[PDB]
Symmetry: C4
């Protein structure tokens, strides 16, 4: 974090400049007691080119704002049209904005941070415009307080497109300035309106995407006027998904990363099911790499028929959270309850037999769907695991 302090310091110094130079263009009486601050600021502004690790079509602003055009124009008392060149330090704003965009810790939303940057920019521009309006005013015997408060109030009035009209321009040189910043205020307010209009669907993107996905389903299903119990259980499933995965589907996000990053993410996510399954306890460094990407999580409600008897289902379902009970062919007797760690349906592919009994969940079971092809591949590739699987299968037969 040796660069976070430096970046904070550079942001503070560039903000100090952007606040300070116009305020002394209007008020030449300043700049006399603030010389050490300006000296330190100039030193910091020149001392960032070697610390940021030459001329570029995009890295020019750094040198354009490091040159000491300040502390010289006031010193020689140049005329205002010629002393206006001191505003070059305002070009450092682009560089500090880019730097703050390239460094983060919270990972702020790009649209919300863009709106924050626009808020900062419009506040800074409001201060600059207020100072400018104050500059071309008739001389008066007023304190700088009320004289600046009135100017800032007028600038915020025009840039907000409110326009009370209590104070208005009265000279042509003021009228041209009023027109220019009226147009700029229209543009800036338009940019802000567009920024909120875009941002309303950018913050907590999952929280809005899940809501929009649920809304259409609920509307159509309520229009069909289906049984309210089904409504209740569907809404319960959807809010449980909201609580567990935050309205996510894994393939919605992992289908962009390349293969090794995808493998690493899958391992760091499914280390749990790697750690609790009996035959996966140190089964192999490679085997987990082949299998971990294929397990597709499935979610079932409290009492739903997982697999009915007589079916030709050839897929093994693992358990990550929940208890599962199996009901035999007499639909009265249950063999046992299968909590986390075990699975069911093993005697479907190896044994080439139909579903011996109906299996149903209890409250909410997090499963792991595995396709028959992957199961066949791992059985034909790893023999000890196939031997163990047949061992538990023949044990469950007894």
């Amino acid at each position: 974090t040796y660069t976070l302090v430096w970046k904070v310091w550079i942001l503070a110094v560039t903000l100090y400049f952007a606040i300070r130079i116009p305020l002394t263009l209007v008020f030449p009486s300043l700049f006399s007691p603030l010389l050490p601050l300006d000296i330190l600021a100039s030193l910091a502004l020149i001392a960032d080119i070697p610390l940021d690790l030459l001329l570029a079509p995009s890295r020019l602003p750094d040198l354009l704002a490091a040159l000491p055009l300040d502390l010289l124009v006031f010193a020689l008392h140049l005329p205002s049209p010629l002393s206006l060149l001191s505003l070059v330090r305002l070009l450092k704003l682009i560089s500090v904005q880019r730097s703050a965009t390239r460094i983060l810790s919270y990972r702020i939303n790009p649209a919300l941070l863009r709106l924050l940057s626009l808020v900062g920019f419009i506040l800074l521009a409001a201060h600059g415009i207020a100072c400018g309006w104050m500059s071309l005013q008739p001389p008066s015997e007023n304190p700088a307080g009320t004289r600046y408060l009135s100017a800032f109030y007028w600038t915020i009035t025009t840039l907000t497109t409110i326009g009370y009209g209590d104070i208005t321009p009265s000279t042509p040189t003021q009228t041209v300035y009023t027109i220019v910043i009226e147009l700029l205020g229209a543009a800036m307010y338009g940019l802000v309106i567009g920024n909120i209009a875009s941002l309303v669907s950018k913050l907590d993107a999952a929280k809005l995407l899940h809501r929009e996905r649920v809304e259409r389903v609920t509307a159509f299903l309520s229009y069909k006027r289906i049984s309210p119990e089904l409504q209740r259980r569907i809404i319960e499933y959807f809010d449980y998904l909201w609580e567990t995965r935050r309205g996510y589907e894994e393939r919605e996000v992992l289908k962009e990363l390349p293969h090794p990053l995808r493998l690493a993410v899958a391992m760091e996510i499914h280390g749990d099911v790697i750690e609790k399954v009996p035959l996966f306890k140190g089964a192999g460094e490679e085997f987990i790499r082949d299998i971990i990407l294929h397990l597709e999580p499935v979610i079932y409600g409290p009492g739903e028929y997982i697999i009915r008897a007589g079916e030709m289902g050839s897929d093994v379902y693992f358990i990550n959270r929940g208890s599962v009970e199996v009901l035999s062919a007499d639909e009265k007797t249950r063999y046992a309850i299968l909590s986390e760690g075990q699975f069911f349906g093993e005697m479907a592919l190896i044994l080439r037999a139909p579903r011996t009994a109906t299996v149903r969940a209890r409250a909410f079971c997090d499963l792991y769907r595995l396709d028959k092809e992957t199961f066949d591949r791992i059985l034909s590739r790893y023999p000890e695991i196939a031997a163990q699987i047949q061992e538990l299968a023949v044990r469950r037969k007894e």
Copy 2:
């Protein structure tokens, strides 16, 4: 509904507070005759933590607004900067908004309800800002009526970005407040503009999606300048779809729910075709589970050629609404008219024969497309149903 009344009561009491505290900050003469209401309100505010079924990073506002900072600041007559702490009750707004978001009966559109919440929030903020503006006003001998009406009129003027300018700030302490709420009014108006700009395509989402889908097809087809009779029949089909399914495709909505919820929804929707088809009358608890998801509804116009003679079509079409006639190879003689309940094309897969005669609808027939693979699977899985199907096939031969 024992919680709906409680939630309505909590909304009413928090709205009463949000309206009441600032109005007595400006007017200390109140709070003397409204003590029982405040006592009951305080009791209700503390009596919701055990009735909502500890400290949390998101459940803090409940305790922050339950603490009785009210009925004490006015009692001891604290100074205004120190008595300003009584506004903590306004944090209950977040909790009541969240609660109202989590409970519904009409299933209001999230964007429209968000706009309603924003309307309520901006009205409440307008009242608060009006009371605040009234607070820092010069003392005058005016009734509280006109004195509050003028303040609210001014607040609604600034927050709407209209600014007539009949009444304007005249002191620096008023000018700073004017600037602050000018910025807040810009932000709030921007939020409202974004909310309507988003909401214009959120209410009755089907009614707009269907319109947008129809518009491009109609525009292109009219550009091609094809025969107007085809225009008329296409538009008739589209409006019939609007009337029947409200511009919906089943797979557009069912492709997100898991398998058992999808099965349950399919049964609750297609119980009709389950109930009228002759061989589906109590055919089996399981068989309907296998078949009901695959029947794809198809819609044909008044006179369209369903299946022409000589084709190798191997799909059975059911009937849900409408009459279908079959024209023989002499294109003059019709065998009969097939109303709801029966089907056609059975002697295509079992008999391995081509289409014996042309079949056409009459006005608008709702069919049920079934693929050859599913038909083969059910024939090879259920034998009595295959026997019955061959029975009606050989009967129709005679």
Copy 3:
């Protein structure tokens, strides 16, 4: 068009009412010389229930606006709060808007027509609000002209959120009205802003979709800095597509219509290629139905290698516009030029031989891609066509 005149008449009469009733609420001196117009209007308003081919949750406004509450309140000179009931005729606006939405000849864009309806509604509301503001004004000796022009000017000032402030409310009963229509003006201006913000990408949807599709390709390809000749020819192809199909892909629009409408549209579009190809001149009523949906149009530039020698291409390319030349294995000698009507590549599937010579277009050739599977199916289904195709193939061998 016997209903277009009736709908125009009903729109005219409801607009006349919506303009007329408030203007006589403010001005009671009217309604004396306009009795025949009101009588005819009332007759027309009651005489539409049997001509529109009972009580409904959505068809209530028709009866609510047909009842003659007008011509009675002015007759008995009811008090203003009680005579305010005459505004029920304004509910006919919903019905006329719905009717105009359900009938069209130009097929106006739904968003642009929605904006036109909103423009009409806001103008009508501006007139109503101006009349209302005029109602609660102090009595004065002014002509109704200037007295209404000032009121309408004020109403358009507030609803536009401009607020000059030359004329402002001065009584509490006026101030409440000012606040109410200030809020309504905010809402209406927000709706208008959202409507344009949505409409900017709704008019001539093809003209914008094609532009957006071309822009990304051009930007990326220019970024790669590839040879400018390729830029020129790619842009030429894209503008030719703009001129010919208006930036369309057939499957983008036909993938929503059902099978028979799709067949009919395909026939009405490809009757040209049906009419010019030698072996398609009355080939068969059914054969065109099987083939016409599969021909995929392909577009090639001036000189592009259609099919090179030595390839295993097994697809027949038809010609709809353009000349095609074939270059032999000596890359100097051309057999002929193939204009519209014929095809090439026939001796690829029947003969099971590789591409005998290279074939290239001349300026811009509109082809018709046909897959090998469909060609095989039609050859194995229709024998005379296969005989003819082999006849031209063996002829081209000689």
Copy 4:
């Protein structure tokens, strides 16, 4: 570029007209010393019909603006309602806008250029409206400077919806004009708001699409709270993609161009890998055409396991940038480092053998994924290349 100068000249002359005619409608004293400019302008306006390579429903404005209605109305001193016809030259604006839309060199963004055109149009309309407002003003002894500056200031006030209210209409003929341009200002400001609201996501579309794609992945992955080293390497991969391909996937853009343009683009992009690979140095004109479209670039991090031992991988990976090392079965000894130019995994399909050793990258390797099917096709189609590949394979065995 013989037409760029002509188009610039026509834009300049039409802008000069649009600025000039209303300014002399208000000020008849002009048009006396500017006759040569108007003569040259008229000549240029008539001399563009034969230089643009008759009557059309869309090409009418050219003739409507070429006719010399100017230099005649002022000459005969027609009355203002009758001399108002001179504004026909403003219809040339549509044609110049269309022409500038059809010709470009920078390939400006259509939305940003549309906003620039709207800015130009609203500025021109502001000038026209200011001149119009100046026209119907009471006569006064004021210089044309202040008299026009005030009018333009007022016009920019109304069209920005600010409305200070320092200068307001005072006559009914002025009030009607004020209402008309108030409505027009509402419409124009709405259009501008919509244009920025759309443009915020149109400039540098790749720069925003890549950011939005990265944001959701980063948010979800940080929510899972996976190991920060994986965060660092994933972010490094994403920024490297930003630097190399600018956040692009080739199939995202090439899946719209037809086959020959796609082939040409692929050759112009992959001429590098064509030029450096040993066996691709002039391998064949056709072979590169078959292979160049299939090579899919893959990117791996510094140390990632490319292909582990014991796998059945049958795909050859080429090298475009980076060094690759292979670790043997003793996981301590490396055979060599494979820099750009060579490949690995050749002895996987020809030899029908499993992966002899583990292969890993070093810093960041740009590969070229080739499917087994394409490799088999080229081996069975080109025999010398297969002989050479087997030669290097058997050499690498030794």
